[PDB]
mmCIF file with all atom_site columns, C-alpha atoms in Angstrom:
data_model
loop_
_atom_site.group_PDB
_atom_site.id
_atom_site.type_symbol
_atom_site.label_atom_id
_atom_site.label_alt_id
_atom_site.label_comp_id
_atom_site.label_asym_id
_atom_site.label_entity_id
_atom_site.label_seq_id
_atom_site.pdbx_PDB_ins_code
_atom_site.Cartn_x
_atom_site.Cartn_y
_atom_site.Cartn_z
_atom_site.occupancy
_atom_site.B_iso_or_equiv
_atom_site.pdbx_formal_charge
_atom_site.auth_seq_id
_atom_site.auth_comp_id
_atom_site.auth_asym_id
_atom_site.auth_atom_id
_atom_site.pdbx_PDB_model_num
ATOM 1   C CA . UNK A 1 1  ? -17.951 3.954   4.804   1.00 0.00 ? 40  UNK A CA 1
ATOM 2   C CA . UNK A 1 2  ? -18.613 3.530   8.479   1.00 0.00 ? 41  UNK A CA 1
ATOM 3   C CA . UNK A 1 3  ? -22.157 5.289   8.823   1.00 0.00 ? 42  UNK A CA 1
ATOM 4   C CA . UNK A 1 4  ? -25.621 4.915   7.133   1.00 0.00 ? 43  UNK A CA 1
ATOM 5   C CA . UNK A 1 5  ? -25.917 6.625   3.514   1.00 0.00 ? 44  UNK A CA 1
ATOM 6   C CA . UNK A 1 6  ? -26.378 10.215  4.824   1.00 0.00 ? 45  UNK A CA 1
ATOM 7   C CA . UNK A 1 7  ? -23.926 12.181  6.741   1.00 0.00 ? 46  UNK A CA 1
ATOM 8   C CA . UNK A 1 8  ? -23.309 14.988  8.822   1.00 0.00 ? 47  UNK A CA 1
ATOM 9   C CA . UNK A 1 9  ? -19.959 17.261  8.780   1.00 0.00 ? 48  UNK A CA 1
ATOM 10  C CA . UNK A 1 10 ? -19.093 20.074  10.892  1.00 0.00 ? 49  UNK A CA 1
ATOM 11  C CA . UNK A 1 11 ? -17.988 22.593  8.531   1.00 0.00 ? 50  UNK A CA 1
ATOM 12  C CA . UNK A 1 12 ? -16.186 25.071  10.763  1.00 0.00 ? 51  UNK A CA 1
ATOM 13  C CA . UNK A 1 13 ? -19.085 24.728  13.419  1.00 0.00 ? 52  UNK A CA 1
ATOM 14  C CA . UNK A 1 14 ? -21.817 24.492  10.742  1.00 0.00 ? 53  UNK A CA 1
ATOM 15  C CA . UNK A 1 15 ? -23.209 21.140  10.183  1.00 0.00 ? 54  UNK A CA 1
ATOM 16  C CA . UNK A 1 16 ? -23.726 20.001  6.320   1.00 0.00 ? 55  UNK A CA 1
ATOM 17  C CA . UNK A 1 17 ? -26.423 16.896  6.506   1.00 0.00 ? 56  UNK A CA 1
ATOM 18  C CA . UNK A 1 18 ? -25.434 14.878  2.807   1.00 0.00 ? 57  UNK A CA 1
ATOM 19  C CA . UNK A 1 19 ? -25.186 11.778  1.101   1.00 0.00 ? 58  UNK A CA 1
ATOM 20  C CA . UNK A 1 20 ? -22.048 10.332  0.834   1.00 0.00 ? 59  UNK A CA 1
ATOM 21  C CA . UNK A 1 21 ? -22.531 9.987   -2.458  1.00 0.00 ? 60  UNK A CA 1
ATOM 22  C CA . UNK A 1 22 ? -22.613 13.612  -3.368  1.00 0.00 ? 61  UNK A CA 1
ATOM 23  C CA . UNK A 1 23 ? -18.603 13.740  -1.379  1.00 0.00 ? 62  UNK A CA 1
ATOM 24  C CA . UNK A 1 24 ? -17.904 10.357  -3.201  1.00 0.00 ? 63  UNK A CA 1
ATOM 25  C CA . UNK A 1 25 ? -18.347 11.486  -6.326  1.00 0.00 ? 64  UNK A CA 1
ATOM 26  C CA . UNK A 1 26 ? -14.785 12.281  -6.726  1.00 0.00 ? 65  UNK A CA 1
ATOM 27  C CA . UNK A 1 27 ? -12.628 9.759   -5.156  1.00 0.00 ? 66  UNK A CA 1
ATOM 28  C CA . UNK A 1 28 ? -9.494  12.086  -4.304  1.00 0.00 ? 67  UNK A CA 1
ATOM 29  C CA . UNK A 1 29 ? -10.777 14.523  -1.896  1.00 0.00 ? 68  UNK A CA 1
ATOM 30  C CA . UNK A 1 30 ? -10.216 14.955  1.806   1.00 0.00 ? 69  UNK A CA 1
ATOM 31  C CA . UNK A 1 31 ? -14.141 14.533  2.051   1.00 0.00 ? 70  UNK A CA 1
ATOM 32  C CA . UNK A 1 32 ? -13.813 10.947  0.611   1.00 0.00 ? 71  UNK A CA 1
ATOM 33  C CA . UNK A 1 33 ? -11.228 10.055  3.457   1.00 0.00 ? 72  UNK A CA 1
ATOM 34  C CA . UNK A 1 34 ? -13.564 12.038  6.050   1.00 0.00 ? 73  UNK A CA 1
ATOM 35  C CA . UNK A 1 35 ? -16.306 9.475   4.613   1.00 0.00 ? 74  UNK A CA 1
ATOM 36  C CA . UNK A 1 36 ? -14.373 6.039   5.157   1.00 0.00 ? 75  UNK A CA 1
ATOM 37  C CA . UNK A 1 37 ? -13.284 4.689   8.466   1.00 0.00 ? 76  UNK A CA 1
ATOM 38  C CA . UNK A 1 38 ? -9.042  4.589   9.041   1.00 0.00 ? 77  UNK A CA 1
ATOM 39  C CA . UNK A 1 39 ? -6.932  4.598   12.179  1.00 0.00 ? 78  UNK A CA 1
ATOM 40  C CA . UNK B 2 1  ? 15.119  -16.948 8.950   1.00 0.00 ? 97  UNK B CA 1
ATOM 41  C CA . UNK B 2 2  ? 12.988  -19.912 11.083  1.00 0.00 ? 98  UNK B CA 1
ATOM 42  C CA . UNK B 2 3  ? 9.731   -18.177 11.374  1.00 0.00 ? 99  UNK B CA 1
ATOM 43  C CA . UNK B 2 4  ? 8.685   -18.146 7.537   1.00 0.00 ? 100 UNK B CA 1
ATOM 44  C CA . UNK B 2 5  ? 11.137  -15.398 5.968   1.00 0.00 ? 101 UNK B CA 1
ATOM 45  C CA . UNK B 2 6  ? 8.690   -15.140 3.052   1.00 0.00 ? 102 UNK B CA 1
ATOM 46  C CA . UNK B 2 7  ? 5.860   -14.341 5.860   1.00 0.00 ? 103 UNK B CA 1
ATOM 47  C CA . UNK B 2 8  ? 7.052   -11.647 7.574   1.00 0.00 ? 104 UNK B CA 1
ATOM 48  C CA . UNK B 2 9  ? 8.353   -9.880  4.641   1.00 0.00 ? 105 UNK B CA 1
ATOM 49  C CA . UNK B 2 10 ? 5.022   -10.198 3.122   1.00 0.00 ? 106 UNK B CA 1
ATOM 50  C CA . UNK B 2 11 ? 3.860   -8.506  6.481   1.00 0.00 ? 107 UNK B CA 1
ATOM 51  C CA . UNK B 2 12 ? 6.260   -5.956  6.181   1.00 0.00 ? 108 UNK B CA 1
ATOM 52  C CA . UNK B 2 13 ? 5.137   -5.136  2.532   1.00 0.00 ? 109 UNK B CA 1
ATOM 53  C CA . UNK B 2 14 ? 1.600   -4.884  3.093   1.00 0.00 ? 110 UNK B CA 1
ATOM 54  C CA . UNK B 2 15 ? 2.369   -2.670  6.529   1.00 0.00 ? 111 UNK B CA 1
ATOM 55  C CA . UNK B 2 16 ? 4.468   -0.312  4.371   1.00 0.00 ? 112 UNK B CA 1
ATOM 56  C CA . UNK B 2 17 ? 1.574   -0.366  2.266   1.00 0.00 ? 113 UNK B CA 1
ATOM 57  C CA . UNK B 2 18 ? -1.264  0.296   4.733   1.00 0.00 ? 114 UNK B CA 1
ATOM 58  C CA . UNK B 2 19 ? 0.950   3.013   5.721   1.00 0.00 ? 115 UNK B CA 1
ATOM 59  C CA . UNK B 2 20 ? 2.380   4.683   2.365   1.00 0.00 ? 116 UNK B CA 1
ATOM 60  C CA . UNK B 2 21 ? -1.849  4.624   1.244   1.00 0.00 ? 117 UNK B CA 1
ATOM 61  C CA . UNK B 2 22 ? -2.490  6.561   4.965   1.00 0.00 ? 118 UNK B CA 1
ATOM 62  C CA . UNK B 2 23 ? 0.832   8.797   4.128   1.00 0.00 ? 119 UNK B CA 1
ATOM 63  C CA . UNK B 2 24 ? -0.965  8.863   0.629   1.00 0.00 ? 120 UNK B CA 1
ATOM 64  C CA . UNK B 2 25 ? -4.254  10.394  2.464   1.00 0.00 ? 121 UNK B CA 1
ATOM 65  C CA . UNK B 2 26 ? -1.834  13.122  4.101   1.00 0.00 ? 122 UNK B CA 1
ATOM 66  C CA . UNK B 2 27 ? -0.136  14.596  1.518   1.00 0.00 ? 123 UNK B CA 1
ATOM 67  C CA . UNK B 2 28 ? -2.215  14.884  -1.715  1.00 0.00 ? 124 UNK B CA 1
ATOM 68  C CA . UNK B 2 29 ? -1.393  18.099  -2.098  1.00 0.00 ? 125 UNK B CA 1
ATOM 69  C CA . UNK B 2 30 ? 2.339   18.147  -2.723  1.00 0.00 ? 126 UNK B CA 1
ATOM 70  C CA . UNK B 2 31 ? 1.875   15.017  -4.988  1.00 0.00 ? 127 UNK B CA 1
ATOM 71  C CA . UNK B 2 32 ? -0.363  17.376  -7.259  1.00 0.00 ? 128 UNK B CA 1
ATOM 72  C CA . UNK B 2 33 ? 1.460   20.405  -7.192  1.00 0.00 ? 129 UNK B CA 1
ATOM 73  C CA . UNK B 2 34 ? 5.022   19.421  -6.626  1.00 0.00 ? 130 UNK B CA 1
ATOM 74  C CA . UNK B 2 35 ? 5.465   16.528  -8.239  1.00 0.00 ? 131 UNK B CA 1
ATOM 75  C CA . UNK B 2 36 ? 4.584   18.639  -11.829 1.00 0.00 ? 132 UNK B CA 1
ATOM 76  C CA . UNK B 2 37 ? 5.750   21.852  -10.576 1.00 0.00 ? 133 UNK B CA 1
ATOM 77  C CA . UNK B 2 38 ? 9.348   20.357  -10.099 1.00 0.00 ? 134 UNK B CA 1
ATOM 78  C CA . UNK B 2 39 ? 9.311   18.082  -13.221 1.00 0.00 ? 135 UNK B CA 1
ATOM 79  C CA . UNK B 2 40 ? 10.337  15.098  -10.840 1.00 0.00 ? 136 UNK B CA 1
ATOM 80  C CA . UNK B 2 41 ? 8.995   11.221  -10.102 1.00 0.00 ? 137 UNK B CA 1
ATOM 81  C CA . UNK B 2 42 ? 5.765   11.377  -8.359  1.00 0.00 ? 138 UNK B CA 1
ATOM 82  C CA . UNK B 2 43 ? 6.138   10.395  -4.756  1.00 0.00 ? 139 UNK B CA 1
ATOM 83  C CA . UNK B 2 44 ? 4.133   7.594   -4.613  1.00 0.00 ? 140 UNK B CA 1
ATOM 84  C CA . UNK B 2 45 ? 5.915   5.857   -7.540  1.00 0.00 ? 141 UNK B CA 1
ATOM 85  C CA . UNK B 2 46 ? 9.139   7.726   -5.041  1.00 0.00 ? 142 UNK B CA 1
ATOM 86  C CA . UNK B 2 47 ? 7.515   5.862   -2.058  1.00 0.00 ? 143 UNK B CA 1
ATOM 87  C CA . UNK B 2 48 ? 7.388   2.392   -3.582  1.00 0.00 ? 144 UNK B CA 1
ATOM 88  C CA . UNK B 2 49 ? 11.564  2.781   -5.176  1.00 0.00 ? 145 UNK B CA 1
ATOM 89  C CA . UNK B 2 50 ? 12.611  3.605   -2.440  1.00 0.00 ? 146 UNK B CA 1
ATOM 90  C CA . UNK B 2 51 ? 11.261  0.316   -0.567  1.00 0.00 ? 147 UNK B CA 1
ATOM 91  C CA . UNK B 2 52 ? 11.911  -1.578  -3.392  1.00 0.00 ? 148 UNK B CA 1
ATOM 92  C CA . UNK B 2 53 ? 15.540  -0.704  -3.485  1.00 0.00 ? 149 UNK B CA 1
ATOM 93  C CA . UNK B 2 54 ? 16.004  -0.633  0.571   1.00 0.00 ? 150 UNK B CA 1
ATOM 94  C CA . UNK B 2 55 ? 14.473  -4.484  0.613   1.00 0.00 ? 151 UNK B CA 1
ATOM 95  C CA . UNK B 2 56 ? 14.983  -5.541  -2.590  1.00 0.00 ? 152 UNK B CA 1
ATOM 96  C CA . UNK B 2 57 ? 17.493  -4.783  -4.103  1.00 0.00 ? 153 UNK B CA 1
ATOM 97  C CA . UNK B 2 58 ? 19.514  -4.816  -1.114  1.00 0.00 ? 154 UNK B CA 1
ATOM 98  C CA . UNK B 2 59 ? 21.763  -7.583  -1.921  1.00 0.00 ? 155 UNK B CA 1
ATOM 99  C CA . UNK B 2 60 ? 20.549  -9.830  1.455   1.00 0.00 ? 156 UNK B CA 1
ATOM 100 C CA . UNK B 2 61 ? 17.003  -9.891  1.737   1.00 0.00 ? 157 UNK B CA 1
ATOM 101 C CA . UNK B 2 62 ? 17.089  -10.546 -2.311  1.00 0.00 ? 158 UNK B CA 1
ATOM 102 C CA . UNK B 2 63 ? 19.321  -13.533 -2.541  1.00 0.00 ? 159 UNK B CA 1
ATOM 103 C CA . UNK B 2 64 ? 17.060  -15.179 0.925   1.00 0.00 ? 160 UNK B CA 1
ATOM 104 C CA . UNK B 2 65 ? 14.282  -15.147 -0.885  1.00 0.00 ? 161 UNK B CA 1
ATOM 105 C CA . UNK B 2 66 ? 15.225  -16.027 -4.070  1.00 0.00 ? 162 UNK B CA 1
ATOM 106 C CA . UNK B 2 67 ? 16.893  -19.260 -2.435  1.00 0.00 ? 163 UNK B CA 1
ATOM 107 C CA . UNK B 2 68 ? 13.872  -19.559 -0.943  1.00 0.00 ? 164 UNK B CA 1
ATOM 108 C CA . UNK B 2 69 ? 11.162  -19.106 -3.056  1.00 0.00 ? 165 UNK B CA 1
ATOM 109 C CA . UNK B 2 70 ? 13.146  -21.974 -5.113  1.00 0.00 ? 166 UNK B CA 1
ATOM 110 C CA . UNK B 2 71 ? 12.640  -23.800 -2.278  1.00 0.00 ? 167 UNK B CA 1
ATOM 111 C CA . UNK B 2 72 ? 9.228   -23.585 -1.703  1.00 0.00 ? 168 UNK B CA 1
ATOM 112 C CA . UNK B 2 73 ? 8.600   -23.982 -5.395  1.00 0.00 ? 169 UNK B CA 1
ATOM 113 C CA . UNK B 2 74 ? 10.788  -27.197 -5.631  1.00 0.00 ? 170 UNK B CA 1
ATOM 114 C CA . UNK B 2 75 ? 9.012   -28.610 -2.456  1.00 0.00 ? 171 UNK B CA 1
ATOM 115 C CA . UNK B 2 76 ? 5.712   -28.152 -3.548  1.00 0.00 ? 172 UNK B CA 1
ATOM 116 C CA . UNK B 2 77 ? 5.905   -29.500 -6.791  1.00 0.00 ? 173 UNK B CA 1
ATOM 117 C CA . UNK B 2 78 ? 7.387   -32.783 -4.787  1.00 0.00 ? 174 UNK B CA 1
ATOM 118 C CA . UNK B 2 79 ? 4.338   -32.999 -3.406  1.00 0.00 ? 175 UNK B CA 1
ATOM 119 C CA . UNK B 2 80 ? 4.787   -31.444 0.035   1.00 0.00 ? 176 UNK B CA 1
ATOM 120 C CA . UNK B 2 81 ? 2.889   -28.192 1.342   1.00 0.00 ? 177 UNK B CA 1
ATOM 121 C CA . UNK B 2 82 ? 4.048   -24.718 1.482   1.00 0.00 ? 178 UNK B CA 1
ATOM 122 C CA . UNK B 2 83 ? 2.597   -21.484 1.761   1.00 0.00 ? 179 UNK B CA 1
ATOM 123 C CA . UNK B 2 84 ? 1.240   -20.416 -1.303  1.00 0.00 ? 180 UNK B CA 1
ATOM 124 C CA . UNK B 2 85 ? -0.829  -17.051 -0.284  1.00 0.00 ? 181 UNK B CA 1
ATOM 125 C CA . UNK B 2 86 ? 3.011   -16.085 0.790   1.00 0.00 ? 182 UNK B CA 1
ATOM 126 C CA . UNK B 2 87 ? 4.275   -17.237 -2.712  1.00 0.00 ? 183 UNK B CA 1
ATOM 127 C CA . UNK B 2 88 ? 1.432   -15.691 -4.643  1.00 0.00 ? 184 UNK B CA 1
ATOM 128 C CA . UNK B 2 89 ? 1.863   -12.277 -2.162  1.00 0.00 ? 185 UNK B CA 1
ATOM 129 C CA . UNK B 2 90 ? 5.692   -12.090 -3.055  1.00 0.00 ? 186 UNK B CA 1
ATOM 130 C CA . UNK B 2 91 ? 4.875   -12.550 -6.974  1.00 0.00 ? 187 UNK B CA 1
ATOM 131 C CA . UNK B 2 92 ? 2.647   -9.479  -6.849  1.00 0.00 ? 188 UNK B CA 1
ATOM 132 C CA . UNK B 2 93 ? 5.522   -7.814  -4.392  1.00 0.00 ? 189 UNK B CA 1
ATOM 133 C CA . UNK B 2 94 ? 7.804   -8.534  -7.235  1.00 0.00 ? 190 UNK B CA 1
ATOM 134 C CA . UNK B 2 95 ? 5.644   -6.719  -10.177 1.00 0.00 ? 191 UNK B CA 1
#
């Protein structure tokens, strides 16, 4: 990743506080690219 | 041709693959639905033909680096030093 464990995503304006765990449970997602640093 | 042929074709090769895994993280979507939907080659394995047949098998670029690598391979079982990350990085290009 690029963050400690737990994250924070703003869902349309509403913030979801998780692990990344629970988003990289599946490894194709767009959460799993939200989770890992890129340009 | 003077500044290490094998190295910046090994930079070009990883750079289209930084960027096909990046144009991989763009469109997911169409690789799961069209790619089936159509009945056609998936567009990563479409992604990696195309390059391999633009650098490749382009007649130029292949016959350069096949004269090369079988220089660098003759050279460095002489006894001399080449570069063998480039060597080893244009094996794995090659499978």
């Amino acid at each position: 990743g690029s963050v400690s464990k737990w994250v924070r995503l703003n869902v349309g304006g509403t913030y979801f506080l998780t692990t990344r765990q629970t988003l990289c449970r599946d490894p194709k997602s767009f959460l799993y690219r939200l989770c890992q640093a890129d340009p | 041709l003077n500044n290490n042929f094998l190295q910046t074709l090994n930079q070009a090769w990883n750079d289209h693959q930084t960027a096909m895994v990046m144009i991989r993280d763009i469109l997911m979507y169409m690789d799961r639905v069209y790619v089936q939907q159509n009945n056609v080659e998936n567009v990563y394995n479409l992604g990696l033909i195309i390059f391999r047949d633009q650098v490749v098998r382009y007649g130029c670029i292949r016959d350069h680096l096949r004269q090369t690598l079988l220089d660098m391979i003759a050279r460095e079982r002489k006894g001399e030093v080449v570069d063998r990350g480039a060597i080893r990085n244009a094996c794995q290009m090659l499978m």
